[PDB]
């Protein structure tokens, strides 16, 4: 019942400085702590009661609390900070915790690198084919993939995923996945997978024959 | 060095019920808070409740409906927690964290326990190389790791030593069937002149498979 306010987002240039606000009703005279999670990570304490500092922390991370608003100031982001932020109050014999802030460095724009790969052996031997492409490291985050077999676009049986954006260059990578069976992926030459995003004018397109 | 270990991902149908442990390794659990944190699927944290062995106090979220149960050990060097009529909605991390009895926050933290409720049945991933189509001068490399349940899978190259370069993408549910991939990129001058191993765990099916690319 007790309601905290964090910004579902915040964006920094690299080296610069980054404040996460902790919108809480008179949160001031509450004790304020804040939690970092990377993607695949479990929280990890970085700022207790308002502005202490865990060992092993670094400086550039510091807290501060008054009003209605407490604040998680992390100075020259690099890269490695790129993560999920909480913050967390008792009130009423209760935890909260504010929904996520994440954290998001820039970094210049990125033409995506293209992959593409044909089925194994091993899933052709189990009756299946899978035919995977590989979009990395681009930077802004929005692309786009297509799906064309021997020149027409398929839509189906089609899988996508994406990555939170690189712990080490702030881009982002995605994989697409088109599956048939080995039947269906026999009755077809062309298998084609091409990339649009923001860098280019035309789509970037990666293609193979079952031929050679 | 004192260390929070849970047990292992779990799977249970809807209306059942979970338990998952918090074991305080090498350390204790008097004089602390111990608390109970979960989190679905790219969602936020929320408390579930916390509970005091010193004051023998435990306490809960609403929004559980009675669901939570948190518990301790004689030993006082475990802790459990209990959720009960289980629905989908409860596909979440669950996660226990400690601190100290005086103060407000936890400072230690569990790796999580993933309890997915479901009545699909276990099945050992299938583990396909994505070999450079039939070279240039940086090359990508791939494992597909297809038709496995439940999650999670654990995928490495090079039984860890490699790590720079790597994309391990998010897994995808299809069909009550999972799928992950993972690239690596390399400078040319190295592939095939090194083996490039996928490395894929699914203890669910205590399933360990290598995958030279």
């Known amino acids: 019942s007790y309601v905290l306010t964090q910004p579902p987002s915040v964006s920094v240039a690299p080296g610069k400085t980054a404040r996460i606000t902790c919108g809480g009703n008179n949160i001031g005279s509450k004790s304020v702590h804040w939690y970092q999670q990377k993607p695949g990570q479990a929280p990890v304490l970085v700022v207790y009661d308002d502005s202490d500092r865990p060992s092993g922390i670094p400086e550039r991370f510091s807290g501060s609390n008054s009003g209605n608003t407490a604040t998680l100031t992390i100075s020259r982001v690099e890269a490695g900070d790129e993560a999920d932020y909480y913050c967390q109050v008792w009130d009423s014999s209760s935890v909260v915790f504010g929904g996520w802030t994440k954290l998001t460095v820039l970094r210049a724009d990125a033409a995506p690198t293209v992959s593409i790969f044909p089925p194994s052996s091993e899933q052709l031997t189990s009756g299946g084919a899978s035919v995977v492409c590989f979009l990395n490291n681009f930077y802004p985050k929005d692309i786009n993939v297509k799906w064309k077999i021997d020149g027409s676009e398929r839509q189906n049986g089609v899988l996508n995923s994406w990555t939170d954006q690189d712990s080490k260059d702030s881009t982002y990578s995605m994989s697409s996945t088109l599956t048939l069976t080995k039947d269906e992926y026999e009755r077809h030459n062309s298998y084609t997978c091409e990339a649009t995003h923001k860098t280019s004018t035309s789509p970037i397109v990666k293609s193979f024959n079952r031929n050679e | 060095q004192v260390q929070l270990v849970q047990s292992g991902a779990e799977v249970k149908k809807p209306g059942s019920s979970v338990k998952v442990s918090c074991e305080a390794s090498?350390?204790?659990?008097?004089?602390?808070?111990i608390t109970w944190v979960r989190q679905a699927p790219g969602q936020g944290l929320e408390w579930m409740g916390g509970?005091?062995?010193?004051?023998?106090?435990?306490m809960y979220a609403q929004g559980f409906q009675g669901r939570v149960t948190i518990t301790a050990d004689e030993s006082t060097s475990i802790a459990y927690m209990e959720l009960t009529n289980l629905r989908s909605e409860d596909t979440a991390v669950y996660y226990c964290?400690?601190?100290?009895?005086?103060?407000?926050?936890?400072?230690?933290w569990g790796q999580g326990t993933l309890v997915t409720v479901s009545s699909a049945k276990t099945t050992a991933p299938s583990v396909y190389p994505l070999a450079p189509v039939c070279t240039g001068s940086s090359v990508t490399l791939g494992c597909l790791v297809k038709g496995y349940f439940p999650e999670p899978v654990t995928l490495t190259w090079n039984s860890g030593s490699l790590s720079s370069g790597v994309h391990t993408f998010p897994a995808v549910l299809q069909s009550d069937l999972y799928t992950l991939s993972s690239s690596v990129t390399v400078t040319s001058s190295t592939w095939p002149s090194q083996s490039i191993t996928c490395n894929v765990a699914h203890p669910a099916s205590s399933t360990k498979v290598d995958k030279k690319i």
């Open positions: 090498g350390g204790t659990l008097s004089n602390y808070v």
């Open positions: 509970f005091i062995p010193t004051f023998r106090t435990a």
């Open positions: 964290a400690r601190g100290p009895l005086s103060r407000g926050y936890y400072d230690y």
